[PDB]
Amino acid sequence: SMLEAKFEEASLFKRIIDGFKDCVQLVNFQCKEDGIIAQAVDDSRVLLVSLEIGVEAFQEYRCDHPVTLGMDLTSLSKILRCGNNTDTLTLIADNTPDSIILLFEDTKKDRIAEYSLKLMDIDADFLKIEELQYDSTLSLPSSEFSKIVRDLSQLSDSINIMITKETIKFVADGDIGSGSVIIKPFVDMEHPETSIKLEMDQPVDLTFGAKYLLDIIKGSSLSDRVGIRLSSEAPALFQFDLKSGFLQFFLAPKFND
Amino acid sequence: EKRSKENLPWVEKYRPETLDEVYGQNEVITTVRKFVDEGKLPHLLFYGPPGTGKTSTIVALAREIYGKNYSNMVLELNASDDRGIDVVRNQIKDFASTRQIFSKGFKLIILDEADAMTNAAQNALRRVIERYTKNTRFCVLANYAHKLTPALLSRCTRFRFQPLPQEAIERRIANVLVHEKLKLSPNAEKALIELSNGDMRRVLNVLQSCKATLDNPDEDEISDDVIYECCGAPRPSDLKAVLKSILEDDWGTAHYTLNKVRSAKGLALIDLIEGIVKILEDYELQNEETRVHLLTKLADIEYSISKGGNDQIQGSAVIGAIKASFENET
Amino acid sequence: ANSIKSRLMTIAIREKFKLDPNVIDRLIQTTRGDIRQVINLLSTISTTTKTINHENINEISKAWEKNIALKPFDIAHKMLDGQIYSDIGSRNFTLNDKIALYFDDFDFTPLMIQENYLSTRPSVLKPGQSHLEAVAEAANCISLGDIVEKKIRSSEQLWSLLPLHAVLSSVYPASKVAGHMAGRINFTAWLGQNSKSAKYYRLLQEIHYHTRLGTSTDKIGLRLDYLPTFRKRLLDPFLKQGADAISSVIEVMDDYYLTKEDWDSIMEFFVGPDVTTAIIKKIPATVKSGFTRKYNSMTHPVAIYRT
Amino acid sequence: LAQQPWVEKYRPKNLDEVTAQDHAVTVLKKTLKSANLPHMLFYGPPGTGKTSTILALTKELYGPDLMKSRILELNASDERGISIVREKVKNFARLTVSKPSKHDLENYPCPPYKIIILDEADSMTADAQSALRRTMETYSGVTRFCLICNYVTRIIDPLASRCSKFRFKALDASNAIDRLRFISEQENVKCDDGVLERILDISAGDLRRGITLLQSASKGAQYLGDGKNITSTQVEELAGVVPHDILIEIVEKVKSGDFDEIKKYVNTFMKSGWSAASVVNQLHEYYITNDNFDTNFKNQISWLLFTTDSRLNNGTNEHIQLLNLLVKISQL
Amino acid sequence: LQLPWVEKYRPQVLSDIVGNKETIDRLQQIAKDGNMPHMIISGMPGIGKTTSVHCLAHELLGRSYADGVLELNASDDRGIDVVRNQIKHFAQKKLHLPPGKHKIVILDEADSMTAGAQQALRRTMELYSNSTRFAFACNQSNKIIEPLQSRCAILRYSKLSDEDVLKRLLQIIKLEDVKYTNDGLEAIIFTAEGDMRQAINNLQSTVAGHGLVNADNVFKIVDSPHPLIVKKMLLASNLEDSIQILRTDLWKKGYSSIDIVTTSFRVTKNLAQVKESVRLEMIKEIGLTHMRILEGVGTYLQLASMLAKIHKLNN
Amino acid sequence: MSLWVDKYRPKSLNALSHNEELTNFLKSLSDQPRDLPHLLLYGPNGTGKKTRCMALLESIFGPGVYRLKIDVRQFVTASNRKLELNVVSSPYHLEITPSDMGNNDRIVIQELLKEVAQMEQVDFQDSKDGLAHRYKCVIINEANSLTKDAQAALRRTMEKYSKNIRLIMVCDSMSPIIAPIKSRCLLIRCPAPSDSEISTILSDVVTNERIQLETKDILKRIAQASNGNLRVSLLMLESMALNNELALKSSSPIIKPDWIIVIHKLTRKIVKERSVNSLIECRAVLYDLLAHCIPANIILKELTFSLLDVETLNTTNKSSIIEYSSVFDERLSLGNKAIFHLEGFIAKVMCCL
DNA sequence: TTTTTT
DNA sequence: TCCGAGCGAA
DNA sequence: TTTGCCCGGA
Ligand SMILES: Nc1ncnc2c1ncn2[C@@H]1O[C@H](COP(=O)(O)OP(=O)(O)OP(O)(O)=S)[C@@H](O)[C@H]1O
Ligand SMILES: Nc1ncnc2c1ncn2[C@@H]1O[C@H](COP(=O)(O)OP(=O)(O)OP(O)(O)=S)[C@@H](O)[C@H]1O
Ligand SMILES: Nc1ncnc2c1ncn2[C@@H]1O[C@H](COP(=O)(O)OP(=O)(O)OP(O)(O)=S)[C@@H](O)[C@H]1O
Ligand SMILES: Nc1nc2c(ncn2[C@@H]2O[C@H](COP(=O)(O)OP(=O)(O)O)[C@@H](O)[C@H]2O)c(=O)[nH]1
Ligand SMILES: [Mg+2]
Ligand SMILES: [Mg+2]
Ligand SMILES: [Mg+2]
């Protein structure tokens, strides 16, 4: 077919999809010769998810010409569940397609399971939203960010991130009181994966809705480290690196009341 | 969309793209355009009857304010979406209180067909509208003001979209004729305007049907005969013949005339009643009792027709109602 | 007012504002005897007004008047009072106020009006209009109100007709028969009668589907036509033959898949000269005990297992 | 063939088989070439060809193989609440149109949209109809709607505005006799002259009823096994029409004006099971076309018949309504 | 964007609120001397209720506003759980304020709160009054249960008079350099019907549209209130003039049949100059037409028939 | 069963004994039943409509149609409320009364009936391949009691699946049947038997039950008192025999049911006393009747025609009464609370007298 | 299951 | 075996 | 100035 992309095991694609399933409903995949990119926007238009999968994630990949596949994530996840984590999963599409084929095939037997999901006429640009020179760029292990978010979300519906010279501060103020976590950069040559990195030109102070961060931290299952890029005038970028590509969340900050 | 815009129904193919293509609402268009020009956009309410240009205008305004990428910069909700209290408190409030993802600027929330929202959701909207005014503006659209709460009405700047007057419809028809290579006679244009009741959707749908009804639309001309054929509507001459027979002839001849006129082109009874009411409205009557009897009895007949019933008995009812009412004229 | 005059005046002395005792009664009427509210009123008013007397009591009373919703019996009493429907009374208690009375309890007000609108001596009767003619006009309006009520609670959910219903079900008929009450205001009997009718329709459905395999009728025809003959095959033989009719009654019950419970239910249905309670009470306990014993001593066919 | 009732057996297969709705069928046939079908609102009285027309149009547009993937049909037998409209209908309207095969593209116009048929749309709640409004407009690029109804006033004004209206006319002897005669010839039904036109007169605008009446009459004739023609008296007996003699008896009782006599006659009359609506129709015909009654009498009786027919349309007791009508006529 | 004038010129101090003079004076007195009672503020839309409560709170609490005020409105969750936990805890919390000052709970749009939730507030109001005081604002005061009304000071606001609206409008006009004529401001007042929000909105709309605020420019964009048109229709002496008003001023302006009929009902209800029995007959006829329209038969003929029947009655 | 109205009910078109022309028509329908249209039987109560429906089904499918069993079917509403429907069935047909479920009758049409329409059935007693080679038959009793929504739900099921299902609807009046449903049906008028036919049937019963009978005129009296209702006449014969020791006499009186006696008493009361107090007592009587399963429409009809029989009233009174009956019969159709409309009718009647 | 106020 | 919750649903 | 039936549970 025009597009043929084989995942060695369907579990890879299932985990990738589960990494952002809860935040958005409709997703637009563009497949090109260099791989598959995808974008989605949440119902309130406050959060945007951007996925990139390179050809190295695939055992075999072929995309003769660019193609766009719009689909609902609930139907896709329902179908992905009908297949086994061990089977080989081939995504197949034809030119000007009305559906996407998910082909679950196991080499042990001669059992083929072919699903066809009807596609939507979702006409929307991606805009490649990424500001060039972000004010502050930091990176830290995913488990620690998850813990900070989970602790502070019990206190308030909003979480403030303040970046200043050599210090990252998370703050939440609520009905029963307030909490404040301060971390500092540190390089540990024995365990680089625990490192906390901070580069910054302009200090930053931005407020975010807690429920959105609670959704965003679900990407921690796909990467041990999370990168955070912040600017005074731009959405905040939360990036989780995959073995081949990436999962990005662009979250708009609250208006300064 | 699929293939060209030539595959679309005319009501959608001719949807205004910019404010200059909205016709017959000049005061509103001028005011809102200068609102945008000066940077003073208040919370808006567009109130009016079907097909007068409300959705067209608000979408054109969004396009002008935000450019071609407006669709990712506004929150548009209508009756096809859930808009309960939970949606107001989560989706709408989050969008109102947060910056734009794509391009910096103020937020626009469009509540189309707002008369479909419950009282509780509308009340939840009050302090959302007031609290986030600095960065967010709401536009509400409605056909029925009575389903909107007084508190919601107070907070909006109201603009009434009128039934489209004759001149605006005429200009839009001229544009359509040029684009379709169509010809339209003056009497046909008059009949079209009369039957549209100032609803542009009716004009465009009828015109498309008329073009489909021609043998050769390049040479054939849309005459009023064509309009009446495709609409299955009475000619004015038929209405006058029936009314004359009712007012001046004996019962046998009036019954015969009604039945024969109806059989000629398979006319519906309700259409005859509407046409005759329009004719009788212009009559000068000595006795107010004549007007009273006519209106009450004909309204009763229209209501009974709306539920089905026996067509022959209803036609005889119309004849008797008119005769008995004019007996009062002495 | 006397039980609290001393307290209010002591407060006036302590807080240093002039209270004329003669107006206290009105204050007491303003708040309907709510002592907390009268103290709140004095506290709030004395902030800028240091003298409460005959020159300001009227507007203070107007501004602070207790607008308390009434309970159903009270709603019915006020709605049927003839004073509020006279020229001056209508000027004072407006049409809007009467509709608000409907909205105080909009599930019982129509029922209360329909219960009690026959129990007045009217003072609003028009010249030459007898009491019965006014009652007939009210009854017609109540029927129309029922039609509106049906439309409100349909799948359409037409709550915008609620004011109209208030007029048709409560205000207009009351306006026709308003006067004085010729007795106490009574709770609506419709609720209990509706409950009883529901019970008996359930019982009728059960009996119908037990006898379905043998009869040819709908349930209504069962009640109107069959049951009177079943009474002669199932009860009268007891009266004419004591315990000798047990076997024949059991044979009929078996033919129609009837239980002892069905027997009781059936006998409950009859009205007028055919009421059975006193007749069955008179049957000797020997016959009833033998009937029950013989019935429980054998098996009986079943029409519907685990209904 | 021998397993279909005639109404379903002779359902039109294509647009050229619909008989008397040319004013609308012509417009529809033009879209096989213009390929810009508008949103449609078919409305009209029972058994005039609305469902047949939409089905035949979809067949002509998509061919037998591609139809199923291009149609969503929802009628009064399906659940159509606001949640259904907001989820199932919206989701179908959103989808990309199924890809047509090469053979399909060769043999059929294959327009670039799908069709949603809301048959019996007048049974949908006003709120669900409201929920359809923006779905119809936003996805016009790939979806066209067809609403079908008997009572156009049950469709909310915004939806009627969005739709292009097609009124289906009543079918009578003037415009449906050809189709009825075709069916009669196909089935080898022998009839006297006048019988088919009488059937269509009795049917009162409904061709389904006329065909069913023809089938019942042919069954009677075949059972009789005598080779004779079906008569008009036989057809009227099958159609529940009151015999002219009985109607004359009623008219004479009304003329006499004695309340008790009218009451007793009506009580006896009801035992025959005559439908009150047919009785009222026949009385209307008898009185309004009678040269022996003057203008005032006919005005009054026309209103009386209108009132009684309206009351019967609400499902009332036929005995009570008929007796009231006859008493009122008698006192004219 | 720039602030709409309604929000730009929202009063920040009590002395900028017009109308309800005696009550505003009492509120200024309280703000100066502390000891704020529990209070219920009620009245019609857009007359200064929310403004007054917020101004009073700001003046009372100064810089302690952020920690000393709990505001909840219809956009918030206010079920029995919230009343029993969040509000109770806020009432119980420590907060040192200057003498005569208390924490303030503002319950805006309180008439939408359920009866059970209101019941849950009674003892919290009573037990913690030495540190917390409650302010309710509502449009329909009869929706606040009597036990809560008992614990509160009752402040019923009246509609704004033409003079108060004129004074506030003149202040804004001088601040904004607006050119106007007396007839223009009178037209603004006429179309506002005592709602200051609407007066300012229509002033902005007229200025944006046509620059100069005179009567003709005002009425180019602002409609005369259709309830007054409907009243004129109902009071006309002969059927033809009433039908003429219906045709020209309502039906051909685009007002829906349902809007016309519901307004007719509301206006007839309040026609104090027509005897009540006549209004009951008229209401019956109006309701018949309303039911027909709800069935989907909302045509001009139905409304004309309604008018004819009303004429038969009032004759 | 044991009661004579049931013991002697005919079981075939050959055993029918009144309205011979209708019997011939039914035989004509059953001659070639493969293209049988949907049927709608209408006529007065108790004349033999269901007897004839069963006889027609017997003629089409054989005596097995009389081997009936009852089964309970479950349904759930959108509000999650549980509902049960009793369904009568033979190997060849189903019988349902959807009005049993009130306003939820629509569910019965949209789920149960539709399912029967879409499925094939097994048969290991008449078919050699285990599948039933025949359409399914569904009898809908009290079809004029279906709500408009349920009737609408029938429309497309009757057309789409005509291959697999045929409907027989039975009703006592067609007035509440919507026009689209009547358009889809072959309408069969079922008139009441004459008094001679009733007398012949009753005489056959008298002979088979060894009842002593002084004169045949007695049967005629019964036949006249039943007003064409054959069920009523057979039950009345049995009751009279039981009360006269299985020996009818010329003096033996006709037995009226309890509810009829109550209604006649109410008529005498209304005629004697026109006043508010009388109206209150009348309300009590009406509540008593309604609570014991006498439907409101039956009460109105019986009261109207009892009043019109009063000898002391004049033509003006009677015309007023029949007008008021028409108006309030429509009210009963359009409303919910029956006592409201019945009381309104009684009040207007009292005023007119 | 809840329309309106002046 | 006894008791009445909560709803009006015949 | 508050009915009739009779829940779920003991
Ligand atoms: N003022 C107008 N000028 C030009 N075209 C119009 C105008 N009004 C309506 N139309 C035409 O009719 C179609 C529908 O216009 P809309 O603006 O969507 O109507 P609407 O006022 O939103 O109707 P409702 O309130 O949703 S029923 C447009 O796509 C145009 O083709
Ligand atoms: N114009 C027609 N041409 C040919 N046959 C028709 C026509 N109209 C009705 N019929 C016949 O009657 C039957 C029913 O036609 P339908 O199209 O289903 O009527 P309908 O307009 O959909 O009726 P409703 O609105 O559902 S009661 C067809 O199968 C045809 O046999
Ligand atoms: N008395 C007033 N004096 C000055 N401005 C007022 C006054 N009343 C209303 N406004 C203006 O209208 C706007 C709204 O005032 P609010 O106090 O919020 O009205 P409201 O009484 O709370 O209306 P509701 O009950 O929420 S619809 C203010 O921001 C002011 O600009
Ligand atoms: N001997 C005889 N009895 C009949 C006949 N038709 C009906 N019956 C009897 O009359 C009773 C009532 O008939 P039924 O069909 O239930 O009346 P319906 O369905 O309400 O019209 C039946 O139980 C039979 O006993 C007939 O043709 N011959
Ligand atoms: Mg619109
Ligand atoms: Mg159809
Ligand atoms: Mg406010």
Author numbering:
A (entry chain F): 0 to 256
B (entry chain C): 6 to 335
C (entry chain A): 480 to 786
D (entry chain D): 22 to 353
E (entry chain B): 7 to 321
F (entry chain E): 1 to 353
What does the primary publication say about this deposited structure?
The DNA sliding clamp proliferating cell nuclear antigen (PCNA) is an essential co-factor for many eukaryotic DNA metabolic enzymes. PCNA is loaded around DNA by the ATP-dependent clamp loader replication factor C (RFC), which acts at single-stranded (ss)/double-stranded DNA (dsDNA) junctions harboring a recessed 3’ end (3’ ss/dsDNA junctions) and at DNA nicks. RFC is composed of four small AAA+ subunits, Rfc2-5, and one large AAA+ subunit, Rfc1, which assemble head-to-tail into a two-tiered partially open ring structure. To illuminate the loading mechanism we have investigated the structure of RFC:PCNA bound to ATPγS and 3’ ss/dsDNA junctions or nicked DNA using cryogenic electron microscopy.
